[model samples]
Target: ADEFGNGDALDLPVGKDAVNSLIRENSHIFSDTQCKVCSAVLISESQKLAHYQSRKHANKVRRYMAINQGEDSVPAKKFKAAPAEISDGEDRSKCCPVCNMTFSSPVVAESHYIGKTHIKNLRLREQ
Candidate 1:
């Protein structure tokens, strides 16, 4: 299979930094180089190379093509780690509604909430 399903060889990248980005960011998938989309395991990089080219992985590439796309948008191995318990006394209202990333303090929350990337992602979500 050139694509995922009979499963893909693995996911890929665009540039030097882009290359590292895809490999590093999706290291979890690389741990096994398995395609969660097609539900198959690959033996080597070339083995799965034709896999991503397949219609199965092709669908995945189209559905999710963004490099920095959030976990909410892209496919991922099921995260077994549960959300860390937030303390009860801390006021949670100041937290950014866009992403659940917690801030150390209200001041920190407020500061991070207005950050450019956060705002950009927030806007991207809206659009």
Candidate 2:
């Protein structure tokens, strides 16, 4: 049926078999009517086949294949940060060395403590 679109291969199969086949195939991530390969819930024939031809869908396919085949030793590796002194510590609440901004008020200081940009910089600084 045209309504099945490119999904007919899966759609034609027995209910759970289709889902399991996709899981086993590993090219596309699936959750029932959802397709992680396209980052969408595809419930129509048109949506399924239309996504099949789209560049974004192909990009995801590339990423999936690249990520899947690129790993050989990943599962065995456990990485850790080496212990080293990171200068001297100051109270994190008073200032953000990450953004190099000092706070004048207790409230402002606490606000900056959890600000998104400050946290991003702090996380980046670790690496």
Candidate 3:
């Protein structure tokens, strides 16, 4: 394959399979790159830049930074590491850390964290 060939050598369809293989085989390509605000995978530098200017992304970053960086930090409504002692079927809210504000839902919480505020903070921290 040519150095710049578009995954033709993978013997898959021109776009989908080849791209999937590239993501799988070379996860490193995306490592070290994250959304500037939320620390989500940026996918590419261009994505990082674009996310920085997005309103949704911006709000998410700000909320996360506010929650994480203040003297009285507001713990995120959802956290990745829940204590194992909490039974799997237990009431998540009872086991989960409480926040002053309401999140739309779990999916919204995840999306909000990935918005521009988080990305912008990421860029500032890098500098």
Candidate 4:
């Protein structure tokens, strides 16, 4: 109907068939979904690319990238200092050699150690 319902509208009839047709036409947009890198659902491709360059996202992306790309060889200096002591059966606190910040877990420390800034320091130290 027209705006006032006094006459039929010029547009084609929109029915269940039209809705079903639209769903079918756009179904591909719902498929083939994956994370841009690790295929994890926590983030999508566009979001990953944009956020990958950010400090927060960059750390995650860099850790995943380093693991995939290959970790740099462990340097002798990394082992020069005696390992930190663990107390009362607690996990050993590991330090990021680059930043020298202590992390409670190796996973946390390793992620930070492999980040862009840390990796840059590693390269600079090598030279």
The number of clashing residue pairs in each candidate reads 10, 0, 13, 0
Model 3: weakest 10-residue lDDT segment is 93-102
Tell me the tens digit of each residue's lDDT in model 3 across 2-120: 47644322222134344444345645432235543454776775664554445676477558757676532223545555333333432433322222233423443445355554455
TM-score of 2: 0.32
What is the TM-score of each predicted model, taking all chains together?
Answer: 0.31, 0.32, 0.27, 0.23
* lDDT tens digits by residue: candidate 1, 10-103: 4444334543454467675532356654557878766455564455665675665554465433112233432344545445534554664545
lDDT of 2 by residue, 1-127 (tens): 5464443222233344554565467554754456775568768655654555456766677777677663221111232442333334466544566665554444555665655656666766787
lDDT-superior candidate, 2 or 3: 2
Ranking the candidates on lDDT from highest down gives: 2, 1, 3, 4
RMSD of each: 13.5, 14.5, 15.9, 18.0
Give the per-residue lDDT of model 4 (tens digit) for 5-110. 4543232214445434433554532112333443344245444333323355435545765666653433322432334454234332465545444554455555
Q: In terms of lDDT, which candidate is stronger, 1 or 2?
A: 2
- Superposed by TM-score, candidate 4 places the C-alpha of residue 101 at a distance from the truth, in angstroms, of 3.1
> Where is model 4 more than 4 Å wrong at Cα?
1-93
**TM-score of candidate 4 on Cα atoms, chains taken together:** 0.23
Q: In what order do the candidates fall by TM-score, top score first?
A: 2, 1, 3, 4
Q: Per-residue lDDT for 7 in model 2?
A: 30
Q: Which stretches of candidate 1 lie over 4 Å from their true place?
A: 1-94
Best candidate (score: TM-score):
2
lDDT of 3: 0.46
Of candidates 4 and 1, the better by TM-score: 1
Candidate 2 Cα outliers beyond 4 Å, as residue runs: 1-32, 70-127
